[PDB]
């Protein structure tokens, strides 16, 4: 199951970005959709399912792409985006 089942709701994940410092650069909507919630006040996020943590976001980074790049074994990623998507990023 998920590492953090309490953050399984996309809407709850989205709410966590109320204090996101990079709104124009990396949209909260895309982050939440990609399984990520905001951890702290800076630019750190974690996936609710695999608990993979990402920081140092650059402008235009794509949350799904980053999810697949760094945590290709995540089952939420697989279920959401499929194996072909993951393979093509790798
Ligand atoms: Zn994940």
PDB file of N, CA and C and ligand atoms in Angstrom:
ATOM      1  N   UNK A   1       0.826  -1.243   0.000  1.00  0.00           N
ATOM      2  CA  UNK A   1       0.000   0.000   0.000  1.00  0.00           C
ATOM      3  C   UNK A   1       0.840   1.264   0.000  1.00  0.00           C
ATOM      4  N   UNK A   2       0.183   2.432   0.050  1.00  0.00           N
ATOM      5  CA  UNK A   2       0.926   3.696   0.072  1.00  0.00           C
ATOM      6  C   UNK A   2       1.703   3.909   1.367  1.00  0.00           C
ATOM      7  N   UNK A   3       2.848   4.573   1.260  1.00  0.00           N
ATOM      8  CA  UNK A   3       3.634   4.967   2.430  1.00  0.00           C
ATOM      9  C   UNK A   3       2.841   5.869   3.373  1.00  0.00           C
ATOM     10  N   UNK A   4       2.067   6.786   2.791  1.00  0.00           N
ATOM     11  CA  UNK A   4       1.332   7.814   3.530  1.00  0.00           C
ATOM     12  C   UNK A   4      -0.097   7.847   2.974  1.00  0.00           C
ATOM     13  N   UNK A   5      -0.943   6.897   3.411  1.00  0.00           N
ATOM     14  CA  UNK A   5      -2.310   6.800   2.874  1.00  0.00           C
ATOM     15  C   UNK A   5      -3.145   8.059   3.076  1.00  0.00           C
ATOM     16  N   UNK A   6      -2.863   8.795   4.146  1.00  0.00           N
ATOM     17  CA  UNK A   6      -3.551  10.048   4.441  1.00  0.00           C
ATOM     18  C   UNK A   6      -3.403  11.131   3.385  1.00  0.00           C
ATOM     19  N   UNK A   7      -2.393  11.008   2.525  1.00  0.00           N
ATOM     20  CA  UNK A   7      -2.206  11.944   1.420  1.00  0.00           C
ATOM     21  C   UNK A   7      -2.591  11.332   0.065  1.00  0.00           C
ATOM     22  N   UNK A   8      -3.415  10.286   0.089  1.00  0.00           N
ATOM     23  CA  UNK A   8      -3.920   9.665  -1.133  1.00  0.00           C
ATOM     24  C   UNK A   8      -4.872  10.534  -1.941  1.00  0.00           C
ATOM     25  N   UNK A   9      -5.527  11.481  -1.279  1.00  0.00           N
ATOM     26  CA  UNK A   9      -6.452  12.405  -1.941  1.00  0.00           C
ATOM     27  C   UNK A   9      -5.707  13.522  -2.662  1.00  0.00           C
ATOM     28  N   UNK A  10      -5.923  13.648  -3.970  1.00  0.00           N
ATOM     29  CA  UNK A  10      -5.292  14.729  -4.741  1.00  0.00           C
ATOM     30  C   UNK A  10      -5.641  16.111  -4.183  1.00  0.00           C
ATOM     31  N   UNK A  11      -6.887  16.295  -3.754  1.00  0.00           N
ATOM     32  CA  UNK A  11      -7.305  17.585  -3.204  1.00  0.00           C
ATOM     33  C   UNK A  11      -6.552  17.935  -1.917  1.00  0.00           C
ATOM     34  N   UNK A  12      -6.345  16.953  -1.035  1.00  0.00           N
ATOM     35  CA  UNK A  12      -5.555  17.179   0.181  1.00  0.00           C
ATOM     36  C   UNK A  12      -4.108  17.524  -0.176  1.00  0.00           C
ATOM     37  N   UNK A  13      -3.548  16.825  -1.159  1.00  0.00           N
ATOM     38  CA  UNK A  13      -2.199  17.145  -1.612  1.00  0.00           C
ATOM     39  C   UNK A  13      -2.147  18.578  -2.149  1.00  0.00           C
ATOM     40  N   UNK A  14      -3.139  18.969  -2.941  1.00  0.00           N
ATOM     41  CA  UNK A  14      -3.149  20.306  -3.512  1.00  0.00           C
ATOM     42  C   UNK A  14      -3.199  21.370  -2.410  1.00  0.00           C
ATOM     43  N   UNK A  15      -4.021  21.134  -1.389  1.00  0.00           N
ATOM     44  CA  UNK A  15      -4.151  22.074  -0.271  1.00  0.00           C
ATOM     45  C   UNK A  15      -2.820  22.322   0.437  1.00  0.00           C
ATOM     46  N   UNK A  16      -1.942  21.313   0.456  1.00  0.00           N
ATOM     47  CA  UNK A  16      -0.642  21.426   1.124  1.00  0.00           C
ATOM     48  C   UNK A  16       0.277  22.454   0.459  1.00  0.00           C
ATOM     49  N   UNK A  17      -0.038  22.846  -0.777  1.00  0.00           N
ATOM     50  CA  UNK A  17       0.765  23.817  -1.526  1.00  0.00           C
ATOM     51  C   UNK A  17       0.320  25.271  -1.326  1.00  0.00           C
ATOM     52  N   UNK A  18      -0.462  25.541  -0.281  1.00  0.00           N
ATOM     53  CA  UNK A  18      -0.923  26.915  -0.028  1.00  0.00           C
ATOM     54  C   UNK A  18       0.248  27.879   0.159  1.00  0.00           C
ATOM     55  N   UNK A  19       1.372  27.366   0.667  1.00  0.00           N
ATOM     56  CA  UNK A  19       2.586  28.153   0.912  1.00  0.00           C
ATOM     57  C   UNK A  19       3.756  27.737   0.007  1.00  0.00           C
ATOM     58  N   UNK A  20       3.439  27.172  -1.155  1.00  0.00           N
ATOM     59  CA  UNK A  20       4.445  26.790  -2.143  1.00  0.00           C
ATOM     60  C   UNK A  20       5.139  28.026  -2.664  1.00  0.00           C
ATOM     61  N   UNK A  21       6.487  28.042  -2.670  1.00  0.00           N
ATOM     62  CA  UNK A  21       7.217  29.241  -3.096  1.00  0.00           C
ATOM     63  C   UNK A  21       7.480  29.377  -4.601  1.00  0.00           C
ATOM     64  N   UNK A  22       7.073  28.383  -5.391  1.00  0.00           N
ATOM     65  CA  UNK A  22       7.408  28.330  -6.822  1.00  0.00           C
ATOM     66  C   UNK A  22       6.164  28.154  -7.703  1.00  0.00           C
ATOM     67  N   UNK A  23       5.086  28.858  -7.376  1.00  0.00           N
ATOM     68  CA  UNK A  23       3.806  28.638  -8.054  1.00  0.00           C
ATOM     69  C   UNK A  23       3.892  28.818  -9.572  1.00  0.00           C
ATOM     70  N   UNK A  24       4.486  29.915 -10.031  1.00  0.00           N
ATOM     71  CA  UNK A  24       4.618  30.158 -11.472  1.00  0.00           C
ATOM     72  C   UNK A  24       5.582  29.175 -12.141  1.00  0.00           C
ATOM     73  N   UNK A  25       6.601  28.749 -11.400  1.00  0.00           N
ATOM     74  CA  UNK A  25       7.689  27.941 -11.944  1.00  0.00           C
ATOM     75  C   UNK A  25       7.344  26.452 -12.044  1.00  0.00           C
ATOM     76  N   UNK A  26       6.677  25.933 -11.015  1.00  0.00           N
ATOM     77  CA  UNK A  26       6.259  24.529 -10.960  1.00  0.00           C
ATOM     78  C   UNK A  26       4.864  24.496 -10.325  1.00  0.00           C
ATOM     79  N   UNK A  27       3.812  24.339 -11.151  1.00  0.00           N
ATOM     80  CA  UNK A  27       2.440  24.462 -10.632  1.00  0.00           C
ATOM     81  C   UNK A  27       2.054  23.425  -9.576  1.00  0.00           C
ATOM     82  N   UNK A  28       1.487  23.881  -8.448  1.00  0.00           N
ATOM     83  CA  UNK A  28       0.921  22.975  -7.447  1.00  0.00           C
ATOM     84  C   UNK A  28      -0.053  21.947  -8.021  1.00  0.00           C
ATOM     85  N   UNK A  29      -0.856  22.352  -9.001  1.00  0.00           N
ATOM     86  CA  UNK A  29      -1.814  21.445  -9.628  1.00  0.00           C
ATOM     87  C   UNK A  29      -1.111  20.228 -10.238  1.00  0.00           C
ATOM     88  N   UNK A  30       0.011  20.462 -10.915  1.00  0.00           N
ATOM     89  CA  UNK A  30       0.786  19.371 -11.516  1.00  0.00           C
ATOM     90  C   UNK A  30       1.500  18.530 -10.460  1.00  0.00           C
ATOM     91  N   UNK A  31       2.058  19.188  -9.449  1.00  0.00           N
ATOM     92  CA  UNK A  31       2.704  18.473  -8.347  1.00  0.00           C
ATOM     93  C   UNK A  31       1.727  17.522  -7.644  1.00  0.00           C
ATOM     94  N   UNK A  32       0.554  18.035  -7.273  1.00  0.00           N
ATOM     95  CA  UNK A  32      -0.449  17.230  -6.574  1.00  0.00           C
ATOM     96  C   UNK A  32      -0.943  16.079  -7.445  1.00  0.00           C
ATOM     97  N   UNK A  33      -1.172  16.359  -8.727  1.00  0.00           N
ATOM     98  CA  UNK A  33      -1.617  15.337  -9.671  1.00  0.00           C
ATOM     99  C   UNK A  33      -0.601  14.203  -9.782  1.00  0.00           C
ATOM    100  N   UNK A  34       0.680  14.555  -9.690  1.00  0.00           N
ATOM    101  CA  UNK A  34       1.774  13.599  -9.780  1.00  0.00           C
ATOM    102  C   UNK A  34       2.068  12.850  -8.475  1.00  0.00           C
ATOM    103  N   UNK A  35       1.222  13.022  -7.457  1.00  0.00           N
ATOM    104  CA  UNK A  35       1.333  12.267  -6.211  1.00  0.00           C
ATOM    105  C   UNK A  35       2.051  12.992  -5.089  1.00  0.00           C
ATOM    106  N   UNK A  36       2.505  14.215  -5.358  1.00  0.00           N
ATOM    107  CA  UNK A  36       3.358  14.941  -4.419  1.00  0.00           C
ATOM    108  C   UNK A  36       2.569  15.842  -3.485  1.00  0.00           C
ATOM    109  N   UNK A  37       3.008  15.888  -2.231  1.00  0.00           N
ATOM    110  CA  UNK A  37       2.541  16.884  -1.270  1.00  0.00           C
ATOM    111  C   UNK A  37       3.729  17.700  -0.767  1.00  0.00           C
ATOM    112  N   UNK A  38       3.436  18.908  -0.298  1.00  0.00           N
ATOM    113  CA  UNK A  38       4.446  19.854   0.150  1.00  0.00           C
ATOM    114  C   UNK A  38       4.890  19.516   1.548  1.00  0.00           C
ATOM    115  N   UNK A  39       6.202  19.374   1.744  1.00  0.00           N
ATOM    116  CA  UNK A  39       6.786  19.042   3.051  1.00  0.00           C
ATOM    117  C   UNK A  39       7.637  20.206   3.529  1.00  0.00           C
ATOM    118  N   UNK A  40       7.102  20.996   4.457  1.00  0.00           N
ATOM    119  CA  UNK A  40       7.803  22.181   4.967  1.00  0.00           C
ATOM    120  C   UNK A  40       7.362  23.439   4.244  1.00  0.00           C
ATOM    121  N   UNK A  41       8.168  24.496   4.342  1.00  0.00           N
ATOM    122  CA  UNK A  41       7.863  25.787   3.707  1.00  0.00           C
ATOM    123  C   UNK A  41       8.683  26.092   2.471  1.00  0.00           C
ATOM    124  N   UNK A  42       9.782  25.361   2.261  1.00  0.00           N
ATOM    125  CA  UNK A  42      10.654  25.561   1.087  1.00  0.00           C
ATOM    126  C   UNK A  42      10.111  24.755  -0.100  1.00  0.00           C
ATOM    127  N   UNK A  43      10.967  24.270  -1.002  1.00  0.00           N
ATOM    128  CA  UNK A  43      10.469  23.583  -2.204  1.00  0.00           C
ATOM    129  C   UNK A  43      10.532  22.047  -2.127  1.00  0.00           C
ATOM    130  N   UNK A  44      10.492  21.493  -0.918  1.00  0.00           N
ATOM    131  CA  UNK A  44      10.556  20.043  -0.752  1.00  0.00           C
ATOM    132  C   UNK A  44       9.169  19.430  -0.896  1.00  0.00           C
ATOM    133  N   UNK A  45       9.081  18.314  -1.615  1.00  0.00           N
ATOM    134  CA  UNK A  45       7.843  17.538  -1.706  1.00  0.00           C
ATOM    135  C   UNK A  45       8.140  16.052  -1.549  1.00  0.00           C
ATOM    136  N   UNK A  46       7.115  15.284  -1.188  1.00  0.00           N
ATOM    137  CA  UNK A  46       7.195  13.827  -1.171  1.00  0.00           C
ATOM    138  C   UNK A  46       5.988  13.216  -1.867  1.00  0.00           C
ATOM    139  N   UNK A  47       6.193  12.058  -2.481  1.00  0.00           N
ATOM    140  CA  UNK A  47       5.091  11.277  -3.024  1.00  0.00           C
ATOM    141  C   UNK A  47       4.388  10.542  -1.885  1.00  0.00           C
ATOM    142  N   UNK A  48       3.058  10.579  -1.874  1.00  0.00           N
ATOM    143  CA  UNK A  48       2.292   9.902  -0.823  1.00  0.00           C
ATOM    144  C   UNK A  48       2.458   8.384  -0.899  1.00  0.00           C
ATOM    145  N   UNK A  49       2.768   7.859  -2.088  1.00  0.00           N
ATOM    146  CA  UNK A  49       2.808   6.417  -2.272  1.00  0.00           C
ATOM    147  C   UNK A  49       4.182   5.814  -2.003  1.00  0.00           C
ATOM    148  N   UNK A  50       5.201   6.298  -2.708  1.00  0.00           N
ATOM    149  CA  UNK A  50       6.561   5.771  -2.552  1.00  0.00           C
ATOM    150  C   UNK A  50       7.398   6.529  -1.517  1.00  0.00           C
ATOM    151  N   UNK A  51       6.896   7.680  -1.059  1.00  0.00           N
ATOM    152  CA  UNK A  51       7.568   8.573  -0.087  1.00  0.00           C
ATOM    153  C   UNK A  51       8.855   9.204  -0.640  1.00  0.00           C
ATOM    154  N   UNK A  52       9.050   9.120  -1.953  1.00  0.00           N
ATOM    155  CA  UNK A  52      10.224   9.709  -2.593  1.00  0.00           C
ATOM    156  C   UNK A  52      10.186  11.213  -2.419  1.00  0.00           C
ATOM    157  N   UNK A  53      11.303  11.792  -1.984  1.00  0.00           N
ATOM    158  CA  UNK A  53      11.379  13.223  -1.720  1.00  0.00           C
ATOM    159  C   UNK A  53      12.182  13.956  -2.779  1.00  0.00           C
ATOM    160  N   UNK A  54      11.622  15.040  -3.315  1.00  0.00           N
ATOM    161  CA  UNK A  54      12.301  15.856  -4.322  1.00  0.00           C
ATOM    162  C   UNK A  54      12.402  17.315  -3.880  1.00  0.00           C
ATOM    163  N   UNK A  55      13.562  17.911  -4.136  1.00  0.00           N
ATOM    164  CA  UNK A  55      13.825  19.308  -3.816  1.00  0.00           C
ATOM    165  C   UNK A  55      14.594  19.947  -4.976  1.00  0.00           C
ATOM    166  N   UNK A  56      15.008  21.201  -4.799  1.00  0.00           N
ATOM    167  CA  UNK A  56      15.814  21.915  -5.796  1.00  0.00           C
ATOM    168  C   UNK A  56      15.126  21.931  -7.162  1.00  0.00           C
ATOM    169  N   UNK A  57      13.840  22.271  -7.150  1.00  0.00           N
ATOM    170  CA  UNK A  57      13.050  22.348  -8.371  1.00  0.00           C
ATOM    171  C   UNK A  57      13.502  23.487  -9.233  1.00  0.00           C
ATOM    172  N   UNK A  58      13.664  23.215 -10.522  1.00  0.00           N
ATOM    173  CA  UNK A  58      14.031  24.235 -11.502  1.00  0.00           C
ATOM    174  C   UNK A  58      12.778  24.642 -12.264  1.00  0.00           C
ATOM    175  N   UNK A  59      12.731  25.883 -12.743  1.00  0.00           N
ATOM    176  CA  UNK A  59      11.560  26.377 -13.468  1.00  0.00           C
ATOM    177  C   UNK A  59      11.272  25.475 -14.666  1.00  0.00           C
ATOM    178  N   UNK A  60       9.999  25.129 -14.856  1.00  0.00           N
ATOM    179  CA  UNK A  60       9.591  24.271 -15.960  1.00  0.00           C
ATOM    180  C   UNK A  60       9.808  22.783 -15.748  1.00  0.00           C
ATOM    181  N   UNK A  61      10.331  22.379 -14.587  1.00  0.00           N
ATOM    182  CA  UNK A  61      10.424  20.951 -14.259  1.00  0.00           C
ATOM    183  C   UNK A  61       9.025  20.365 -14.322  1.00  0.00           C
ATOM    184  N   UNK A  62       8.903  19.161 -14.870  1.00  0.00           N
ATOM    185  CA  UNK A  62       7.613  18.492 -14.975  1.00  0.00           C
ATOM    186  C   UNK A  62       7.498  17.432 -13.878  1.00  0.00           C
ATOM    187  N   UNK A  63       6.545  17.604 -12.942  1.00  0.00           N
ATOM    188  CA  UNK A  63       6.447  16.667 -11.817  1.00  0.00           C
ATOM    189  C   UNK A  63       6.394  15.179 -12.196  1.00  0.00           C
ATOM    190  N   UNK A  64       5.585  14.810 -13.187  1.00  0.00           N
ATOM    191  CA  UNK A  64       5.513  13.406 -13.601  1.00  0.00           C
ATOM    192  C   UNK A  64       6.832  12.899 -14.127  1.00  0.00           C
ATOM    193  N   UNK A  65       7.499  13.704 -14.953  1.00  0.00           N
ATOM    194  CA  UNK A  65       8.808  13.341 -15.502  1.00  0.00           C
ATOM    195  C   UNK A  65       9.832  13.117 -14.388  1.00  0.00           C
ATOM    196  N   UNK A  66       9.859  14.034 -13.426  1.00  0.00           N
ATOM    197  CA  UNK A  66      10.757  13.916 -12.280  1.00  0.00           C
ATOM    198  C   UNK A  66      10.423  12.675 -11.438  1.00  0.00           C
ATOM    199  N   UNK A  67       9.132  12.391 -11.271  1.00  0.00           N
ATOM    200  CA  UNK A  67       8.679  11.202 -10.534  1.00  0.00           C
ATOM    201  C   UNK A  67       9.233   9.952 -11.175  1.00  0.00           C
ATOM    202  N   UNK A  68       9.125   9.878 -12.499  1.00  0.00           N
ATOM    203  CA  UNK A  68       9.579   8.709 -13.258  1.00  0.00           C
ATOM    204  C   UNK A  68      11.099   8.612 -13.345  1.00  0.00           C
ATOM    205  N   UNK A  69      11.769   9.759 -13.406  1.00  0.00           N
ATOM    206  CA  UNK A  69      13.226   9.809 -13.450  1.00  0.00           C
ATOM    207  C   UNK A  69      13.852   9.242 -12.178  1.00  0.00           C
ATOM    208  N   UNK A  70      13.336   9.664 -11.027  1.00  0.00           N
ATOM    209  CA  UNK A  70      13.966   9.373  -9.740  1.00  0.00           C
ATOM    210  C   UNK A  70      13.381   8.189  -9.016  1.00  0.00           C
ATOM    211  N   UNK A  71      12.083   7.943  -9.195  1.00  0.00           N
ATOM    212  CA  UNK A  71      11.395   6.858  -8.486  1.00  0.00           C
ATOM    213  C   UNK A  71      10.604   5.969  -9.448  1.00  0.00           C
ATOM    214  N   UNK A  72      11.299   5.355 -10.422  1.00  0.00           N
ATOM    215  CA  UNK A  72      10.622   4.591 -11.470  1.00  0.00           C
ATOM    216  C   UNK A  72       9.848   3.355 -10.991  1.00  0.00           C
ATOM    217  N   UNK A  73      10.112   2.889  -9.770  1.00  0.00           N
ATOM    218  CA  UNK A  73       9.425   1.719  -9.213  1.00  0.00           C
ATOM    219  C   UNK A  73       8.145   2.027  -8.455  1.00  0.00           C
ATOM    220  N   UNK A  74       7.780   3.304  -8.375  1.00  0.00           N
ATOM    221  CA  UNK A  74       6.584   3.711  -7.648  1.00  0.00           C
ATOM    222  C   UNK A  74       5.328   3.153  -8.310  1.00  0.00           C
ATOM    223  N   UNK A  75       4.481   2.493  -7.527  1.00  0.00           N
ATOM    224  CA  UNK A  75       3.294   1.851  -8.078  1.00  0.00           C
ATOM    225  C   UNK A  75       2.174   2.826  -8.420  1.00  0.00           C
ATOM    226  N   UNK A  76       2.096   3.944  -7.699  1.00  0.00           N
ATOM    227  CA  UNK A  76       1.190   5.030  -8.067  1.00  0.00           C
ATOM    228  C   UNK A  76       1.560   5.614  -9.434  1.00  0.00           C
ATOM    229  N   UNK A  77       2.847   5.870  -9.637  1.00  0.00           N
ATOM    230  CA  UNK A  77       3.361   6.297 -10.936  1.00  0.00           C
ATOM    231  C   UNK A  77       2.974   5.299 -12.026  1.00  0.00           C
ATOM    232  N   UNK A  78       3.247   4.018 -11.787  1.00  0.00           N
ATOM    233  CA  UNK A  78       2.929   2.974 -12.767  1.00  0.00           C
ATOM    234  C   UNK A  78       1.441   2.942 -13.099  1.00  0.00           C
ATOM    235  N   UNK A  79       0.605   2.895 -12.066  1.00  0.00           N
ATOM    236  CA  UNK A  79      -0.844   2.835 -12.248  1.00  0.00           C
ATOM    237  C   UNK A  79      -1.376   4.055 -12.996  1.00  0.00           C
ATOM    238  N   UNK A  80      -0.788   5.217 -12.716  1.00  0.00           N
ATOM    239  CA  UNK A  80      -1.246   6.484 -13.278  1.00  0.00           C
ATOM    240  C   UNK A  80      -0.770   6.695 -14.711  1.00  0.00           C
ATOM    241  N   UNK A  81       0.509   6.429 -14.962  1.00  0.00           N
ATOM    242  CA  UNK A  81       1.157   6.803 -16.226  1.00  0.00           C
ATOM    243  C   UNK A  81       1.522   5.635 -17.129  1.00  0.00           C
ATOM    244  N   UNK A  82       1.590   4.424 -16.578  1.00  0.00           N
ATOM    245  CA  UNK A  82       1.904   3.237 -17.367  1.00  0.00           C
ATOM    246  C   UNK A  82       3.394   3.002 -17.552  1.00  0.00           C
ATOM    247  N   UNK A  83       3.745   1.776 -17.925  1.00  0.00           N
ATOM    248  CA  UNK A  83       5.147   1.377 -18.027  1.00  0.00           C
ATOM    249  C   UNK A  83       5.871   2.026 -19.210  1.00  0.00           C
ATOM    250  N   UNK A  84       5.166   2.230 -20.320  1.00  0.00           N
ATOM    251  CA  UNK A  84       5.786   2.823 -21.509  1.00  0.00           C
ATOM    252  C   UNK A  84       6.318   4.216 -21.198  1.00  0.00           C
ATOM    253  N   UNK A  85       5.495   5.013 -20.520  1.00  0.00           N
ATOM    254  CA  UNK A  85       5.889   6.350 -20.082  1.00  0.00           C
ATOM    255  C   UNK A  85       7.166   6.312 -19.248  1.00  0.00           C
ATOM    256  N   UNK A  86       7.213   5.407 -18.275  1.00  0.00           N
ATOM    257  CA  UNK A  86       8.372   5.287 -17.387  1.00  0.00           C
ATOM    258  C   UNK A  86       9.612   4.866 -18.179  1.00  0.00           C
ATOM    259  N   UNK A  87       9.446   3.864 -19.038  1.00  0.00           N
ATOM    260  CA  UNK A  87      10.539   3.369 -19.872  1.00  0.00           C
ATOM    261  C   UNK A  87      11.110   4.448 -20.790  1.00  0.00           C
ATOM    262  N   UNK A  88      10.238   5.271 -21.367  1.00  0.00           N
ATOM    263  CA  UNK A  88      10.675   6.314 -22.302  1.00  0.00           C
ATOM    264  C   UNK A  88      11.493   7.419 -21.624  1.00  0.00           C
ATOM    265  N   UNK A  89      11.190   7.707 -20.358  1.00  0.00           N
ATOM    266  CA  UNK A  89      11.981   8.666 -19.579  1.00  0.00           C
ATOM    267  C   UNK A  89      13.356   8.091 -19.229  1.00  0.00           C
ATOM    268  N   UNK A  90      13.411   6.780 -18.997  1.00  0.00           N
ATOM    269  CA  UNK A  90      14.678   6.064 -18.831  1.00  0.00           C
ATOM    270  C   UNK A  90      15.130   5.492 -20.144  1.00  0.00           C
TER     271      UNK A  90
HETATM  272 ZN1  LIG B   1       5.836   7.832  -5.959  1.00  0.00          ZN
END
